[PDB]
């Protein structure tokens, strides 16, 4: 029948790619997706959509929206019969979740830099208002502090490439210069790198970066991103499918975790490979001088 | 009070930003929004999404998906009375379509590079199976031949960054070196930029790149992107606004054309052949100075 | 005797200085001041401060707190029975208040920049949750639109020096380089100045700045800041006296505007930036180049 | 419940930041703060302030004011039945005190100037009526003389910037030119910086300056200041936290010494030409760049 989705209200790549995916599995099964957008931020925001969908004679809610444990439980209580699958909650909460692995995404990342030798790492998290955002953060710690490393810089962006740009800009001007950054999403990485680059730094060779999501543009960032990929095509499938087993089968309740993996691209290198430029920056000042004279 | 939206399934940036704008205005004017995603298969798929929208008892429709005139005429028909505003057809198409000036954006893109002094212009458009991606291509022509120049090479991506990277690497790896490329959208320009930088070509100073759209991430594209900005918020207000009025008859029929703008950033410079410029030489220095800060 | 003061518990200097002057004038009169502090919320945070206060059996109340018109009416009523004088509200309110003229402050700042020939002016607003900041920006405008000028920058800070830095820096990175900025307080002005300076620009010559408070430090900011002086001492004496007479039966009640002025210092100059930049730029780059390499 | 505070009615940066950090913690605990202000006077103004807080019927007392020998002891004596916790006396004080390490603070500052290679050190001490001002100067000396160094000159300011400025201008027009100055507070270090800059000297490269406190603004002073950070956020919490213990019943007595650090920023460097300075040079290339930029 009709599967309803509650999602962003902001055009973020990860939430969009998962919708595109849900809508994609629905086709191969002859099912109809009817999407509802959740008013910017909140609890009573998801509720209105869950009312809106249950209303549109749907048969299964895929809550593609961030809710802290109490809220999630407070929203599945709203979807009455219409079974629900929470795609963004904690894998500890009492609903039918289907979360991506944060113990591993964080471990795989925290682990890559370290084996490369990095000990001066910085953390760039998404709004801590977001559960997944938070969990991603706790993981960062758990593992850095379990590999004997306490982060030199810990910031909070809002998923945007520009808050990723801004945040690294401010961090490097506060004086903190990590050899590696652990970023909570792929767009703040576009930004952290625009930040890193326009400082004289070389992403990888000077300041490394590992994103999270491996969203579509990522392979094409102008130093392609080493990321923690979260297969949204597989997520969309796995979910449409478990959703149907809630109503049209036996709700084998609990939470399922999808795997995650490190996509080694071109933004991570061992620290202090170092080129800082001695008579070299002089060399350059000198080359622009003659151009500067050629000017006037 | 229920805008029904037929939107693409493709997870491209521009259309999701438009959806966020249409829904923001939903929230503001008291109305509701229900989305039905069109798989990329013409009106056949579009009109079915129209049926499902029309089945949830939507007040009116916003069909935001590329309809080929004659397809547009048909999607419309299947919106049985219910008012339909078209966000992606031809202004030259006899239906109710609000459309960004395909004539302005292509003039500004061309006019920008001619004034900088480029004569060797390469064109990279989206999939010719799109009126916007045909109306854009025709547009680069009117003004290239007008300002007396024919495109040295022209390719076709699919709106994604990978297609930009590849087409440009092909043109580039085929012997063709343009000084400025006029790219259809912003995601694809992300990739032009990468094919440019991986061939030892500095985007901007060697091969300038002009995008189109100005999708939220564009300003953090490392060399921030110069682009034809198309305001998607304005689409969110004019469409929702007009949809509600439309829905209540009021003879404001046919196409309405919207403003465009050149958001100039760091990807367009005077060609490989000038000097550098007081503009390009000031930037060169400040990154050198910034390195001199850390240097010693 | 006892005059209870309800104040901002965030340590911004301007309000510290008013509480200080109330302590100063209550001392002259043989009176005691008791400061209750307000959490960062709205009216219920100021209201409870009134109850914390009222309870101490105070005879008058001075609300040194940004109330949003209607909320001033609410606190005015919570702390009734006892005479209440509001110091950070709008002159439009049906309460006893003592505000500093915003029309002047905003004109004086907008006019000194104009007589000097500034055309590209930027605006640094305080958090618009503040009725004061909210009012400073309106005039920046009223006098700028009445002088043929439109701001080419409109940013908001939270009053700290660091938010002043981030916003001036963000704007210069966005590409906007105004000849003068009209800042809303001296702290953001310090940061704006620290921003302009680390960009290679000159406070005064390349970018003038006009703060707004004439806080104690302003005299010693690197380029001694030219500000709109708000005399918190005259404010502390008049507010105390007016409360002690309201304490009695002496009305003369409603809204009362204290004057304000423009303290010329060093940050203001004309945009007569000597455009000289002779072929001397090259030779001078040259020396800096040798200079750079000498220590490496 | 209620904690009364006897603070300085002079509006200084740090004392205002503690009173805030006291409010913050008092908040988290369900404690209600009432502030009384102390006009500078011996044990006198403080005894009457104590009385006002006793009249207000408070649970405990936090005395945040510069109390001398038997001043602290008399003010304690008048604090009948309410426990008094002092924030500004000495160690060698038989009262419940809690202040930052002056042995550590002055040691780190000094030995930071001695590791960079200076020997010509200046002192801009605070007003000698403050116990900590005189403790801070004791420490400048103790460690100055243990590193075989002896200050070339020393000054007394009154904690404001205008005084640092004058005390610093005075010594500079007296022939005494130090390679570094150790200053009692950042507000005082601000004017010393104005003083140095105006005498044609480059703060940091000519006269390194080390403040003490790290009040909010410092991170944004022109050359951002190197300071002995004193965390008022902990003084505020430990004070309120301990204050209630002493009256809860867990009699936790005597003085407690909170740790301190040095925040290295941009006002300290080594003194020299075979230094030629990296930030000095860098500030110059961006000034040059911002001069080439306007070459059109």
Curated annotation (Swiss-Prot), chains A, B, C, D:
Q: Which GO terms describe its cellular component?
A: cytosol
Miscellaneous: Removing residues 1-59 results in loss of DNA-binding activity but retains tetrameric structure and inducer-binding activity. Deleting residues 340-360 results in loss of tetramer formation, but retains dimer formation, inducer-binding activity, and DNA-binding activity (if residues 1-59 are present).
Self-association and partners:
Homotetramer.
Cysteine disulfide partners in this protein:
none
Name of the molecule in the record: Lactose operon repressor
Q: What does this protein do?
A: Repressor of the lactose operon. Binds allolactose as an inducer.
What fragment of the whole protein does this chain represent?
A: 62 to 357 of 360
The keyword Calcium belongs to this UniProt entry's keyword annotation: no
What keywords are assigned to this protein?
DNA-binding, Repressor, Transcription, Transcription regulation
């Amino acid at each position: 029948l009709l599967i309803g989705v509650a999602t962003s209200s902001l055009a973020l790549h990860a939430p969009s790619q998962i919708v595109a995916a849900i809508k994609s599995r629905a086709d191969q099964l002859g099912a109809s997706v009817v999407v509802s957008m959740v008013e910017r931020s909140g609890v009573e925001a998801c509720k209105t959509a869950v009312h809106n969908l249950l209303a549109q004679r749907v048969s299964g809610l895929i809550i593609n929206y961030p809710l802290d444990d109490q809220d999630a439980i407070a929203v599945e209580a709203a979807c009455t019969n219409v079974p629900a699958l929470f795609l963004d909650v904690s894998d500890q909460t009492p609903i039918n979740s289907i979360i991506f692995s944060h113990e591993d995404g964080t471990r795989l990342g925290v682990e890559h830099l370290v084996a490369l030798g990095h000990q001066q790492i910085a953390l760039l998290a998404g709004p801590l208002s977001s559960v997944s955002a938070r969990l991603r953060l706790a993981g960062w710690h758990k593992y850095l502090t379990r590999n004997q490393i306490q982060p030199i810089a810990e910031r909070e962006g809002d998923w945007s490439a520009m808050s990723g740009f801004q945040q690294t800009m401010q961090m490097l001007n506060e004086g903190i210069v990590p050899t590696a950054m652990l970023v909570a999403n792929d767009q703040m990485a576009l930004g952290a790198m625009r930040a890193i680059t326009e400082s004289g730094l070389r992403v990888g060779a000077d300041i490394s970066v590992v994103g999270y999501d491996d969203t579509e543009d990522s392979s094409c960032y102008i130093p392609p991103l080493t990321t923690i990929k979260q297969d949204f095509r597989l997520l969309g499938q796995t979910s449409v499918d478990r959703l149907l087993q809630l109503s049209q089968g036996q709700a084998v309740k609990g939470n399922q975790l999808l795997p995650v993996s490190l996509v080694k691209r071109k933004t991570t290198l061992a620290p202090n490979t170092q080129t800082a430029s001695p008579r070299a920056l002089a060399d350059s000042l000198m080359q622009l001088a003659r151009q500067v004279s050629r000017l006037e």
